[PDB]
Amino acid sequence: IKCPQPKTLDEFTIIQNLQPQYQFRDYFIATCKQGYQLIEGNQVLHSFTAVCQDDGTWHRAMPRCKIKDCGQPRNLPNGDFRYTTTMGVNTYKARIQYYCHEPYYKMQTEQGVYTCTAQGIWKNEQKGEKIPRCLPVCGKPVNPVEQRQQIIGGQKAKMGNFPWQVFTNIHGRGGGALLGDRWILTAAHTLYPKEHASLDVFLGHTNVEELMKLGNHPIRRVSVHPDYRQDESYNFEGDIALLELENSVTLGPNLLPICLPDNDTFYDLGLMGYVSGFGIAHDLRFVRLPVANPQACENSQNMFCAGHPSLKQDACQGDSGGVFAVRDPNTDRWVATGIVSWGIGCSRGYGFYTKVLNYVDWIKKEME
């Protein structure tokens, strides 16, 4: 007819339905303060109810209330996190901080702070239960072309110089630029040559053999801009394409994306940019040339001319599908202003190029 008016085994247990005395058939309930869960031996309990049996004894043993554990923080692809609290303890109230592998990636928004909630899972000051996202940083080579030089003509390209450079080889050697994590910008005629599929694509290195040793990157999808017409002898309008990599590449010092242009001034006469390509020249080379007066090439409005006559062959460095890159110092970022297009007359000193700014919209649309 009586049970022992019982007590907690710690400061984390709380008694529910507490009475002055406990008669047979009665019951009391146990729970825990925030952050603590009911444990019985080596077992978590959703709840605890003890009924007072006739022999005057509680049908079950008072449980214990222990701290909860949010477990091992999820992994942040291209980043990492550190404990901001005793290291390695994923217990209630612990605090960790995620971060990205800068300078190559940047965290998508101290916002990578997740603490272990009373609910037993890592959460943000309102960034959810979801972890941050580390994004590819575009146009900031970690070994950029020295500006302390203006070396007229072709130069041997060093590693890190054009980290976005893509060596293509589908219907002949071609080029392209890595955009983001998984896109390569290039020319349409590179995939569909005019005058009449195995998309062999390589990246990450200055040397061709080394590039090929690094391995091909499978293309998952191809997008040729709607204008581009190949049956027509010469239009070069819409000569631009996008390739989507089946898998994404890992950024680093020799493999980084280039940025997209957005201001018309990237096509002002006299503005210096760069062009890189192979010639299988065995090694990647580059030329610094200026945006030339359209007549220069005339001799479209979705294109631009670049070169100088005192350059002869050196104005054919770009590989077709390759990118005309500009270093915008008022933001210190490299952008892809042009796409190497029909190279007729590049030995007279000038190159033709598709104006990328005019297709940024379409590109971005394709990339989503």
Ligand SMILES: *[C@@H]1O[C@H](CO[C@@H]2O[C@@H](C)[C@@H](O)[C@@H](O)[C@@H]2O)[C@@H](O[C@H]2O[C@H](CO)[C@@H](O)[C@H](O)[C@H]2NC(C)=O)[C@H](O)[C@H]1NC(C)=O
């Ligand atoms: C559109 O571009 C203008 C040109 O900016 C220059 O050329 C870019 C390609 C890049 O290399 C940048 O670093 C250069 O400054 C830009 O600047 C123009 O206006 C500013 C006033 O804000 C003036 O100081 C500057 O001299 C101008 N540029 C020129 C031709 O010298 C302009 O602000 C920009 N606007 C847009 C649409 O964002």
